[PDB]
Amino acid sequence: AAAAKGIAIALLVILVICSLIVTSVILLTPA
Amino acid sequence: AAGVAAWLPFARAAAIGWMPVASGPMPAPPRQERKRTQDALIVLNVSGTRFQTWQDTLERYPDTLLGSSERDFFYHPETQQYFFDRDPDIFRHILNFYRTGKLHYPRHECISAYDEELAFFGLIPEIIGDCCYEEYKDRRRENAERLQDDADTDTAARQRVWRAFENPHTSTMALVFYYVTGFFIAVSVIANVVETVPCGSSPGHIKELRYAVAFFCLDTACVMIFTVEYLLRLAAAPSRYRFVRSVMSIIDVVAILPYYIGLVMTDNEDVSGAFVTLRVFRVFRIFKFSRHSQGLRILGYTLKSCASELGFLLFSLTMAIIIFATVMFYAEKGSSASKFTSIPAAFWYTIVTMTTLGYGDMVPKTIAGKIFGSICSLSGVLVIALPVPVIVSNFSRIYHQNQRADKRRAQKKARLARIRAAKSGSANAYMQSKRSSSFETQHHHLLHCLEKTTNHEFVD
Amino acid sequence: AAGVAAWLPFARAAAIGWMPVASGPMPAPPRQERKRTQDALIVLNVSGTRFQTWQDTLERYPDTLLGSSERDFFYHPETQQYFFDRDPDIFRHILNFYRTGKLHYPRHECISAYDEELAFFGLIPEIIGDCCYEEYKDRRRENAERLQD
Amino acid sequence: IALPVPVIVSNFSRIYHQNQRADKRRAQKKARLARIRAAKSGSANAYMQSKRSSSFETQHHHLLHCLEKTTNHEFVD
Amino acid sequence: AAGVAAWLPFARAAAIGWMPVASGPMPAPPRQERKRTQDALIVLNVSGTR
Amino acid sequence: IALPVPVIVSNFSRIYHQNQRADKRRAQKKARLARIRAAKSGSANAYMQ
Amino acid sequence: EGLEQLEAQTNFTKRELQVLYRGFKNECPSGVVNEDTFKQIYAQFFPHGDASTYAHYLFNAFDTTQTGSVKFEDFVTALSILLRGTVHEKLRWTFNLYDINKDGYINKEEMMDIVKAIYDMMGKYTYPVLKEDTPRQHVDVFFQKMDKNKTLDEFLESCQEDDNIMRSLQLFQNVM
Amino acid sequence: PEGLEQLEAQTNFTKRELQVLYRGFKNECPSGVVNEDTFKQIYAQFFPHGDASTYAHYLFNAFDTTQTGSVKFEDFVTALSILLRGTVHEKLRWTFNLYDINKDGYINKEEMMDIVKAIYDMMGKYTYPVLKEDTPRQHVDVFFQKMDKNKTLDEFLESCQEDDNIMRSLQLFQNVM
């Protein structure tokens, strides 16, 4: 529950940072 | 045979039949202990109930326990009556076997106890006289599969690491490992969905002059994630090539091949009308959700369990389609619109109405069209709904099996914990005996002998 | 455990396996009685029919009522037979458990009565063999929801 | 679409059966409590008859008389 | 009630509870045939089973 | 239309069950006749001994 | 134990002991009786009023060590001292029963709730028509029989100073 | 194996005790032929300490001659007889066969390491002097002290009487039962 919720937020953060890496990659090639 | 030993005198008379046609010495009887049947009823007891029966009946069948000589151990000379420690009601059927020559099986008694009693008296299980066999073998198979599910023997360097990765719930680790993949496959498939909406990625608002082609970057990232996950799985396989052929593994490998093949095609010779097939396979990433929800696995087990009658569904559907189309086309080949141009053009009608779907793109016009169209609709209801329950009931049964397996796994673990607790209690009792109703004393004495023979002492 | 008394000599025999390696005072058997077996058929009649069984068989599970010294409350002296005032059928399954160690449970029995007779003799439900345990738990569940209503 | 409908309808039928059997059970419980009240009334009337004029009932009525005297209040119908 | 006639001695002890608060003649026991429970088991047979 | 379909499908399932159980029964009958032949062979060999 | 407990902890014969044990076991097969069984049995003996609180007091007297459920050992010990012991043991048991707490002295409210436990037994079908008036005349009369000074020893000596209470005990002693 | 054929003749037990032994034997192995798999848990449950399957495995093949894979009642009772109420000379011959694992009756110092470590495996972890990896080989060397320094069944059979520990340890169960 709450203990699982903490690691759920922790993994939400790593998913977000992976998506932000993807956004950095797409911004690397604009037009 | 020995099963009808009560009818020797019959054959004795039969012997007199072939006396005048005989030519020999007539080797005479081999004599006997007694030419009578005064052998009295022998009181054989089972846990306090006396089952009197005649000796000749017992030695009618020799190889069983009650036959031959192995009953002497159970003999009780100081009161002159056989004693057995077994179950009375169970033993009654074994008693009946000697009287008749074929056992039975009670509708309502535990198969484990009955089978162990049956084997105890040394008589083969399949003596059943095909009157209760249909039920005994049914219950025996049910118990056998119950204990097979009792034998799931699930376990816990990298040999345990990859299993823990496969473990659905390791709290902090496996939950992250699954959630990342679930989110990423979800965003991949939703990207494939949205890469088609006009404003998203297509010439929807650029004709005047956003069409942001970044879905290629997202697809590349996602498929990189898939391929690294599958490389981890390939290093995680106990048998590298042997476990590739698995269903989930082949779904994974076909969930990654289209991207690589597309890249190889891009720098290869371009073939017109071929990239559409490649883009179609982009949707198969959604199949990876099998590991997400067990319902997909239950459905796969259903479709590959009742895979016999699905062939019948397909074959009978083809029969009905052909039969009704070949009468539809000839029924109204000549008409105003004459939409039923040909039989392959009538397949669509006979399948849009066999399924009770109903569009109106093509409908019968002649009167002879109407009757057979309605007949087709009813036949479609029948054929379609015929193999439904064999699938949905099978699916529900398999789901109940998979719930029962978890329940019995939890119960088995609790029982094992109780066994460990009882063992610890035995050790505690021995220690208490050492510090300060005969079997416990003798057991403690034997452990004391172990203490001396191995010069080591026991402490809590 | 305590239910394998019949194999006690065998373990004794196993001791001979390590006599050459043994080095100790060998405390010697503790004044056991009746070297030759004089087991008598103890009879338990339960409001009617009688079940005959040994004493070592009946005493391998001392935590229950038929074990221990509790059963001596029910000894009926002038006839020399324990007269339990219980049901004459479920007791058969209880005796079967004493014989094996894995108690069973048939289907055609009321849960209230069966559980009452099972708790009277000091037994606990979890001992039921795994083969009958599922059906027992289902019946207990439906009777429990009945009493909940 | 046909996969979950048997489950849904089976659950609905089961719940309807639970409701109807609960109603019948409540009627049965009312009958049982009425029977218990009737049994107490019958025992009281039997004691009344004994006051006017089985082995167990002798000592039962004796204890009831003891309760009567320890409070010096007698019992009427 | 008569269904728990095995537990008269219990209530007998319970009687001793309200002795000092009593005021009356204490009408004494109605006597008995036997103040024991030696009534032996009675073999009642049903079609051959006792 | 939904009135007769449960009857039809129940009959079909029943008939399929009858076929499969008949096949299993025929296998059982073959096993039983083999056992009878084995029993006669055993009695003959006992007489030989 | 039942094999050595012949008279060491009881004043009961072996046959009486075992038949009483079977009677007890037929009601509480687990071997230990709780308070709900006490209400059930005690009310079933008196199917005319309500006496749950008196049975509560009886169990609390029975339940030594405040365990919450008395085993057979203490139950049979209490029965023996109540029915086939000496009068001093009965008076000690009356001390324990009337002493709802762990105090020494006895106050007004103890006789209040005991006399309520007695008076609620009847109901509303008695000729004198009991009310709240009678219980505290009864308790008052007890108090003038009790010491004027504001005693367990005094209550004792009052018990062995009156013949009626002394003879109110043997009539259950001999029988059963 | 008729219950009267295998009396004190070839099986030195009274028939009254032999009946009880058979009753308790078939009560655990109804088929009448015990397999080594059953031979493990019927034994390990005697010791609530560490497992004993290792010793039971070496017991079984000694019990089961000719590698039948399972023991019948006749051999079981024969061995139980020669142990519990057998001859002191004949008691130790089987045990020499037990200690021998290389089939032929020869000692090459390796058949005792496993046996002694299996015997020491019973106590587990709750021992007073905590076991160390050197302790089993030390006890094996203690046993090597009493075996033939010169380069045996004959010396062991002649020195077992020399060590009175064996002599009054074998008699613990010879008289009893």
Reduced to 3 states (helix: H, G, I; strand: E, B; else coil), residue H60 is helix
* Partner-chain contact B459 H30, CB within 8 Å: no
Q: Are B188 and B217 in contact (CB under 8 A)?
A: no
Give the count of domains, chain H.
Answer: 1
Write the DSSP assignment of B413-458 as a string of letters.
HHHHHHHHHHHHHHHHHHHHHHH---HHHHHHHHHHHHHHHTT--B
Q: Are B246 and B304 in contact (CB under 8 A)?
A: no
Reduced to 3 states (helix: H, G, I; strand: E, B; else coil), residue G21 is helix
What SS3 string covers G77-122?
A: HHHHHHHCCCHHHHHHHHHHHHCCCCCCCCCHHHHHHHHHHHHCCC
Q: What is the DSSP letter of B189?
A: H
Q: Are C94 and C118 in contact (CB under 8 A)?
A: yes
- Distance (Å, rounded) from C-alpha C101 to C-alpha C3? 7
Instruction: Please return the burial class of G144, using the count of CB atoms within 10 Å of its CB with bins 0-12, 13-18 and 19+.
Output: exposed
H18 and chain C in contact, CB less than 8 A: no
Write out the residue range of the structural domain in which residue H147 sits: 1-177
Which of left, alpha, beta for G122 (phi over 0: left; psi -120 to 50: alpha)?
alpha
Q: Are E13 and D63 in contact (CB under 8 A)?
A: no
Measured between CA atoms, how close is G51 to chain C, in angstroms?
Answer: 26
Q: Are C54 and C42 in contact (CB under 8 A)?
A: yes
Q: Would you say B357 is a known binding-site residue?
A: yes
Q: What angle do CA B452, B457, B459 make, to 5 degrees?
A: 155
- Which tokens go with G47? 């199917």
The position carrying tokens 């009881």 is G10
CA dihedral over B445, H167, H17, B117, signed as positive or negative:
positive
Which residue in chain G has the smallest CA separation from C124? Answer: G30
Q: Which of H82, H68, H75, H61 lies closest to H1 in space, CA to CA?
A: H75
Amino acid at position F35, single letter:
R
β B82-84/C42-46 pair status: unpaired
Residues, chain D: 77
Q: Which residues of G are annotated as a binding site for Ca(2+)?
A: 99, 101, 103, 105, 110, 147, 149, 154
Fold of B7-150: Potassium Channel Kv1.1; Chain A (3.30.710)
Measured between CA atoms, how close is D6 to chain C, in angstroms?
Answer: 22
Q: Which of B324, B356, B354 lies closest to B340 in space, CA to CA?
A: B324
B32 and chain A in contact, CB less than 8 A: no
N- to C-terminal Cα separation, chain A: 46
Q: Are B43 and B52 in contact (CB under 8 A)?
A: yes
Which residues from C are below 8 Å from E47, CB to CB?
A: none
**Which residues lie below 8 Å from residue F14, measured CB to CB, with a gap of 6+?**
none
Amino acid at position H149, single letter:
K
Which of left, alpha, beta for B255 (phi over 0: left; psi -120 to 50: alpha)?
alpha
- Distance (Å, rounded) from C-alpha B424 to C-alpha D33? 50
Candidates G45, G46, G122; nearest CB to D73:
G122
Measured between CA atoms, how close is D3 to chain G, in angstroms?
Answer: 49
Q: Are E26 and D69 in contact (CB under 8 A)?
A: yes
Distances (CA, A) of B264 to B220, B271, G43, G147: 14, 12, 91, 112
G1 and chain C in contact, CB less than 8 A: yes
- Which tokens go with C104? 């069973």
Candidates E7, E32, E35; nearest CB to G41:
E7
N- to C-terminal Cα separation, chain G: 22
- Distance (Å, rounded) from C-alpha B340 to C-alpha B328? 8
The position carrying tokens 């669509």 is B348
Q: Which of C61, C18, C56, B445 lies closest to H17 in space, CA to CA?
A: C56
Reduced to 3 states (helix: H, G, I; strand: E, B; else coil), residue B400 is helix
Which residue in chain B has the smallest CA separation from H17? Answer: B73
Measured between CA atoms, how close is C24 to chain G, in angstroms?
Answer: 39
Reduced to 3 states (helix: H, G, I; strand: E, B; else coil), residue B82 is strand
- Which tokens go with D73? 């209040």
**Which residues lie below 8 Å from residue B401, measured CB to CB, with a gap of 6+?**
B149
Distances (CA, A) of F28 to B126, B140, F37: 10, 16, 14
Q: Are C63 and C122 in contact (CB under 8 A)?
A: yes
- Distance (Å, rounded) from C-alpha C45 to C-alpha H152? 61
Q: How many helices (H) and strands (E) does chain C have?
A: 5, 4
CATH superfamily of this structure's domain B157-304: Voltage-gated potassium channels. Chain C (1.20.120.350)
Q: What is the DSSP letter of C69?
A: T
β C81-84/C42-46 pair status: parallel
What SS3 string covers H1-53?
A: CCCCCCCCCCCCCCHHHHHHHHHHHHCCCCCCEEEHHHHHHHHHCCCCCCCCH
- Which tokens go with B269? 């010779």
Q: Would you say C93 is a known binding-site residue?
A: no
Q: Chain G: list its partners (3+ Cβ pairs within 8 Å).
A: C, D, E
Reduced to 3 states (helix: H, G, I; strand: E, B; else coil), residue B359 is coil
Q: Are B398 and B301 in contact (CB under 8 A)?
A: yes
Residue H35's DSSP bridge partners are H70
Which residue in chain G has the smallest CA separation from E29? Answer: G171
Sequence ranges of the domains in chain C = 5-149
Q: Which CATH architecture has domain C5-149?
A: 2-Layer Sandwich (3.30)
- Distance (Å, rounded) from C-alpha G145 to C-alpha G159? 10
Amino acid at position H81, single letter:
S
Amino acid at position D19, single letter:
N
* Partner-chain contact G15 E36, CB within 8 Å: yes
Reduced to 3 states (helix: H, G, I; strand: E, B; else coil), residue G55 is helix
What SS3 string covers B286-344?
A: HHHHHCCCHHHHHHHHHHCCCCHHHHHHHHHHHHHHHHHHHHHHHHCCCCCCCCCCCHH
Q: Would you say C76 is a known binding-site residue?
A: no
Residue H127's DSSP bridge partners are B458
- Distance (Å, rounded) from C-alpha D65 to C-alpha D51? 9
Resolution (A): 3.9
Q: Would you say B104 is a known binding-site residue?
A: yes
Please count the other Cβ atoms lying within 10 Å of the Cβ belonging to residue G147: 13
Which residues from A are below 8 Å from B172, CB to CB?
A: 7
Which residues from G are below 8 Å from E11, CB to CB?
A: 42, 45
Which residue in chain B has the smallest CA separation from A14? Answer: B180
Question: H-type helices in B18-132, by residue range?
Answer: 55-58, 88-100, 111-120
- Distance (Å, rounded) from C-alpha F2 to C-alpha H62? 72
Which residues of chain G form beta strands (DSSP E)? none
Q: Which residues of E touch D (CB under 8 A)?
A: 1-2, 5, 8, 11-12, 15, 18-19, 21-27, 29-30, 32-33
Phi–psi pair at G9, nearest 5 degrees:
-115, 15
- Distance (Å, rounded) from C-alpha C55 to C-alpha B437? 11
Q: Are G21 and C73 in contact (CB under 8 A)?
A: yes
Which residues from F are below 8 Å from B390, CB to CB?
A: 13
- H or E element in which residue C12 lies: helix C8-15
* Partner-chain contact B143 C130, CB within 8 Å: no
Q: Are C88 and C81 in contact (CB under 8 A)?
A: no
Q: What angle do CA C13, C14, C16 make, to 5 degrees?
A: 75
- H or E element in which residue H115 lies: helix H111-120
- Distance (Å, rounded) from C-alpha B4 to C-alpha H146? 67
**Which residues lie below 8 Å from residue G104, measured CB to CB, with a gap of 6+?**
G152
Long-range contacts of B439-445 (CB under 8 A, 24+ apart): B439/C2, B439/C5, B439/C8, B439/C59, B439/C60, B440/C2, B441/C30, B442/C8, B442/C29, B442/C30, B442/C32, B443/C2, B443/C8, B443/H46, B445/C27, B445/C29, B445/C30
Instruction: Please return the burial class of B252, using the count of CB atoms within 10 Å of its CB with bins 0-12, 13-18 and 19+.
Output: buried
- Rounded to whole angstroms, the maximal C-alpha distance in chain E is 57
- Distance (Å, rounded) from C-alpha B1 to C-alpha G9? 70
Q: Are D71 and G122 in contact (CB under 8 A)?
A: yes
Which residues from A are below 8 Å from B183, CB to CB?
A: 15
**Which residues lie below 8 Å from residue H167, measured CB to CB, with a gap of 6+?**
H88, H160, H161
- Which tokens go with C118? 């099972």
Q: Which of G124, C120, H30, E16 lies closest to B90 in space, CA to CA?
A: H30
Amino acid at position C142, single letter:
E
Q: Which of B312, E3, H133 lies closest to G44 in space, CA to CA?
A: E3
Q: What is the CA radius of gyration of chain H?
A: 18
Reduced to 3 states (helix: H, G, I; strand: E, B; else coil), residue B277 is helix
Q: What angle do CA E11, E16, E19 make, to 5 degrees?
A: 135
- Distance (Å, rounded) from C-alpha A13 to C-alpha E16? 76
Distances (CA, A) of B103 to B125, B127, H26: 9, 6, 22
Candidates H24, H59, H115; nearest CB to C7:
H24
Q: Which of H37, H40, H58, H35 lies closest to H119 in space, CA to CA?
A: H58
CA dihedral B98, B100, B101, B105 (to 10 degrees): -90
Q: Which candidate in A5, A7, A20, A23 is best for mutational testing of the B interface (most B CBs within 10 A)?
A: A7
- Distance (Å, rounded) from C-alpha B116 to C-alpha B112? 6
Q: What angle do CA D61, D65, D71 make, to 5 degrees?
A: 145
Measured between CA atoms, how close is H140 to chain C, in angstroms?
Answer: 9
* Partner-chain contact D2 B392, CB within 8 Å: yes
Please count the other Cβ atoms lying within 10 Å of the Cβ belonging to residue B433: 15
Q: Are B199 and B205 in contact (CB under 8 A)?
A: yes
Please count the other Cβ atoms lying within 10 Å of the Cβ belonging to residue C123: 22
- Which tokens go with C143? 């009777």
- H or E element in which residue G133 lies: helix G133-145
Reduced to 3 states (helix: H, G, I; strand: E, B; else coil), residue G70 is strand
Instruction: Please return the burial class of B200, using the count of CB atoms within 10 Å of its CB with bins 0-12, 13-18 and 19+.
Output: middle
- Which tokens go with B89? 């009601």
Write the DSSP assignment of B125-161 as a string of letters.
GGG--SSSHHHHHHHHHHHHHHHHHHT------HHHH
Q: Are C88 and C113 in contact (CB under 8 A)?
A: no
The position carrying tokens 């046959």 is G15
* Partner-chain contact B175 A8, CB within 8 Å: yes
Q: Chain C: list its partners (3+ Cβ pairs within 8 Å).
A: B, D, E, G, H
Which method resolved this structure? cryo-EM
- Distance (Å, rounded) from C-alpha E24 to C-alpha E26? 6
**Which residues lie below 8 Å from residue G1, measured CB to CB, with a gap of 6+?**
C69
- Which tokens go with E25? 């003649």
- Distance (Å, rounded) from C-alpha B345 to C-alpha B367? 20
Q: Are H100 and H106 in contact (CB under 8 A)?
A: yes
